[PDB]
Amino acid sequence: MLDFSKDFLFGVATASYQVEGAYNEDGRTMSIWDTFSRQDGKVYKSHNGDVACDHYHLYKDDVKMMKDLGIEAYRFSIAWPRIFPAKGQYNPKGMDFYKRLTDELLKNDIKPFATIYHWDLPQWADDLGGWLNREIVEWYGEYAEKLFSELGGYIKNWITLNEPWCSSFLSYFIGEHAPGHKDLGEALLVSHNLLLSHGKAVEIFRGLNLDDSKIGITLNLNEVFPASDSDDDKVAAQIADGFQNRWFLDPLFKGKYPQDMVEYFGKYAKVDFINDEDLKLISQKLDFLGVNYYTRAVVQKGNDGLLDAVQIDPGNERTEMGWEIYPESLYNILMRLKREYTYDMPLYITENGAAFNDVVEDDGRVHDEKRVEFLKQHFKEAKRFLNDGGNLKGYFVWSLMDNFEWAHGYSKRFGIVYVDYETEKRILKDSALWYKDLISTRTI
Ligand code: NA
Numbered sequence: 001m002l003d004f005s006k007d008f009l010f011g012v013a014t015a016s017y018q019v020e021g022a023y024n025e026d027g028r029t030m031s032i033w034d035t036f037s038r039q040d041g042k043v044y045k046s047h048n049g050d051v052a053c054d055h056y057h058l059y060k061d062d063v064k065m066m067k068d069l070g071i072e073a074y075r076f077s078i079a080w081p082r083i084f085p086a087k088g089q090y091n092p093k094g095m096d097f098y099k100r101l102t103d104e105l106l107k108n109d110i111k112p113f114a115t116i117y118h119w120d121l122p123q124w125a126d127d128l129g130g131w132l133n134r135e136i137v138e139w140y141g142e143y144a145e146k147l148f149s150e151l152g153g154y155i156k157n158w159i160t161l162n163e164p165w166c167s168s169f170l171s172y173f174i175g176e177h178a179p180g181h182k183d184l185g186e187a188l189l190v191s192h193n194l195l196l197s198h199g200k201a202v203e204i205f206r207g208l209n210l211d212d213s214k215i216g217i218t219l220n221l222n223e224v225f226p227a228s229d230s231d232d233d234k235v236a237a238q239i240a241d242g243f244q245n246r247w248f249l250d251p252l253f254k255g256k257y258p259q260d261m262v263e264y265f266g267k268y269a270k271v272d273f274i275n276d277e278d279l280k281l282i283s284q285k286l287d288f289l290g291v292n293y294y295t296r297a298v299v300q301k302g303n304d305g306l307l308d309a310v311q312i313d314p315g316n317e318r319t320e321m322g323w324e325i326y327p328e329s330l331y332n333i334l335m336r337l338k339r340e341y342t343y344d345m346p347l348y349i350t351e352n353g354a355a356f357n358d359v360v361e362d363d364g365r366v367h368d369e370k371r372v373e374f375l376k377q378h379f380k381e382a383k384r385f386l387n388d389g390g391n392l393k394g395y396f397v398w399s400l401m402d403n404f405e406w407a408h409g410y411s412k413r414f415g416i417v418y419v420d421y422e423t424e425k426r427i428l429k430d431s432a433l434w435y436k437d438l439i440s441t442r443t444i
Pocket residue numbers: 016017018019020021022023049050051052
């Protein structure tokens with residue numbers, strides 16, 4: 001009778017630096033993204049998160065807004081520079097924000113899902129080497145354990161890292177994200193230290209044996225298609241798939257980096273950070289996996305160089321990011337996890353959503369019909385996965401509101417709610433009204 005059971009969580013997601021603002025208040029010190037956004041050329045028109053959506057001050061209105069939509073769960077991140085503004089220096093005022101945030105959520109029947117690290121590493125940590133310095137495993141563990149002990153009565157669903165592929169390859173190899181290095185060997189080592197920090201937090205978490213509390217990790221995953229049936233394109237797809245997906249799925253869920261990628265990367269950089277003890281910590285059992293899904297890739301062999309597959313445009317509709325709208329890969333990825341990696345483990349879609357050219361019309365409304373159709377198509381694939389025996393527990397739309405989209409600044413709008421940044425006014429887009437109906441009827 002219900003496409004989505006009463007227990008299925010309809011959610012929305014944000015991230016601290018993208019929405020909070022109040023960047024220099026109540027003891028907060030700079031993150032690497034504060035620093036990076038002030039370096040010339042790194043962020044669209046030198047946008048930064050100084051103010052963002054001012055959600056730090058407006059959080060009560062934002063929670064009321066979610067309550068009126070019937071939101072059942074809210075994924076947010078916790079800002080490390082608020083909690084430890086300096087090495088070893090706990091800031092109770094920073095903790096107080098997350099207590100009053102999560103108190104507000106619970107009192108409005110919204111379940112909190114907290115992301116421990118969503119890219120806003122404290123500048124003091126990066127000055128000590130950041131994710132390149134293996135000591136970060138201990139700094140992160142100290143941070144996580146403080147959150148578990150202070151917030152464990154408030155939060156029962158924890159995510160160690162958001163999208164470690166971005167924090168490693170996009171930040172240290174491609175250089176689009178903070179801190180903006182361009183060195184494959186660095187990005188490979190960072191990926192390992194991120195995964196090792198993840199394992200440290202899981203170890204600490206299990207030792208607390210908190211009542212009714214779950215821990216997992218969030219991975220951005222795609223599906224890679226070869227442009228043709230040639231052997232050239234099949235190897236290209238295999239490499240692209242190992243680069244995005246298997247490089248993280250395999251150590252976490254198989255206890256082993258993917259050997260084809262280890263050999264491929266080893267032709268270009270050192271891969272000597274791999275060892276048995278680290279992989280055992282990395283692959284500790286999780287309670288759930290969070291899946292961030294947006295699009296697929298169609299790839300063709302490039303010119304034999306490092307990760308130089310040519311991106312094929314198959315000619316289909318795309319978002320403002322240039323990302324193809326291909327809802328079937330949401331089903332294919334969830335099925336692939338079920339058949340190859342996570343099996344019967346609970347799965348959450350921790351991000352899915354789209355950037356479109358949103359405009360407030362003369363009627364004061366945002367008629368974002370393309371986003372309505374986008375979300376409708378992807379929720380239909382989630383329902384199909386559930387009806388085929390998939391263990392999907394919830395679905396978080398990215399994002400609750402338009403926000404600071406990293407190197408794109410405020411020029412990409414992902415919200416189901418529009419933010420007029422001059423006034424900080426919230427305007428429900430038609431997609432939020434559609435989502436409200438979906439939560440109410442649980443029918444699609
Ligand atoms: Na901010």
